[PDB]
Design a protein around this ligand. Structure first.
Ligand SMILES: CCCCCCCC/C=C\CCCCCCCC(=O)OC[C@H](O)CO
Ligand SMILES: CCCCCCCC/C=C\CCCCCCCC(=O)OC[C@H](O)CO
Ligand SMILES: *C/C=C(C)/C=C/C=C(C)/C=C/C1=C(C)CCCC1(C)C
Ligand SMILES: CCCCCCCCCCCCCCCCCCCC
Ligand SMILES: CCCCCCCCCCCCCCCCCCCC
Ligand SMILES: CCCCCCCCCCCCCCCCCCCC
Ligand SMILES: CCCCCCCCCCCCCCCCCCCC
Length: 225
């Protein structure tokens, strides 16, 4: 009980600092080419709001823990993970387009493909939810969920990446961290829930700060006056 709550606190600590940083990042002036980074940072702040509501609920609920509340995290993830995948797409497009691109052009051109990515991701979460609530066995959950995880990342890779080390860092860091949620699924309640508490820091709040640093680095001259 204790170590779950201590990790929830650590996660909440990073979330609050990250939220403050992201808010200031909204007000950094941007050059034409970098406009989409503020768009990304709005959608990472939306993810934070959903994140936080879950954590507050969690630390209140963990006072009188009578049952296994791991499955409640899916009501978070079913909302946050598609948003996270879209921002990843927008960040890859930013990194990889020679001309300035904005999320509207992306969304109007790619909405069908984006729906396939989010459908694959929804199936991953659905299979996890069925396993996490014991409606299918753990082995079927890990194989079915991993299949869809791989499909989601494959679709992302073949459409939006380029073959270079900046892409590999962003893609494979994300891929590994997401896979580690599947790894956590294998563990008993307390250890599982602790891992998810620390994984959220990496999957959400390190991303936001990264985007913040990219914005600051791109705009520092424009900012300074
Ligand atoms: C928005 C303002 C903050 C709300 C978080 C309040 C959370 C306080 C809950 C603490 C419960 C506890 O003691 O655990
Ligand atoms: C963590 C270390 C970062 C690795 C590379 C990813 C960051 C790449 C940032 C690209 C920003 C940039 O150069 O934007 C203008 C062009 O597009
Ligand atoms: C902000 C929350 C995020 C990024 C959470 C993502 C969760 C996953 C990628 C979970 C995936 C699963 C597997 C890879 C296999 C077992 C079932 C899941 C749902 C735990
Ligand atoms: C933590 C806070 C870090 C903020 C760094 C950037 C500051 C942006 C302020 C923007 C105000 C308008 C500038 C023109
Ligand atoms: C071409 C290389 C594609 C690499 C995809 C990585 C994620 C999916 C793993 C295999 C299904
Ligand atoms: C070129 C670099 C490819 C490295 C891919 C494997 C290491 C990263 C972790 C992958 C986790 C699924
Ligand atoms: C990056 C993910 C880190 C995962 C480790 C979480 C720490 C707690 C794990 C269980 C400890 C017992």
């Amino acid at each position: 009980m204790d170590n779950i709550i201590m990790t929830a606190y650590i996660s909440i600590f990073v979330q609050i600092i990250t939220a403050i940083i992201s808010v200031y990042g909204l007000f950094i002036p941007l050059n034409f080419k970098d406009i989409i980074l503020r768009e990304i940072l709005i959608l990472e702040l939306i993810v934070q709001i959903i994140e936080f509501i879950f954590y507050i609920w969690l630390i209140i609920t963990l006072q009188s823990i009578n049952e296994d509340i791991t499955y409640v995290r899916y009501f978070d993830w079913v909302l946050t993970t598609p948003v996270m995948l879209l921002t990843t797409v927008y960040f890859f497009e930013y990194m990889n387009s020679d001309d300035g691109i904005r999320k509207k052009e992306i969304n109007d051109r790619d909405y069908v493909y984006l729906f396939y990515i989010c459908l694959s991701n929804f199936f991953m979460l659905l299979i996890g939810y069925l396993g996490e609530t014991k409606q299918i066995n753990k082995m079927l959950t890990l194989f079915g969920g991993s299949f869809f995880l791989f499909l989601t990342f494959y679709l992302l890779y073949v459409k939006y990446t380029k073959e270079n080390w900046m892409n590999y860092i962003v893609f494979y860091f994300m891929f590994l961290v997401w896979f580690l949620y599947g790894f956590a699924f294998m563990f008993p309640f307390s250890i599982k829930n602790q891992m998810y508490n620390i994984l959220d820091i990496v999957s959400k709040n390190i991303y936001s700060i990264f985007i913040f640093i990219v914005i600051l680095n791109q705009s520092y001259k424009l900012l300074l006056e």
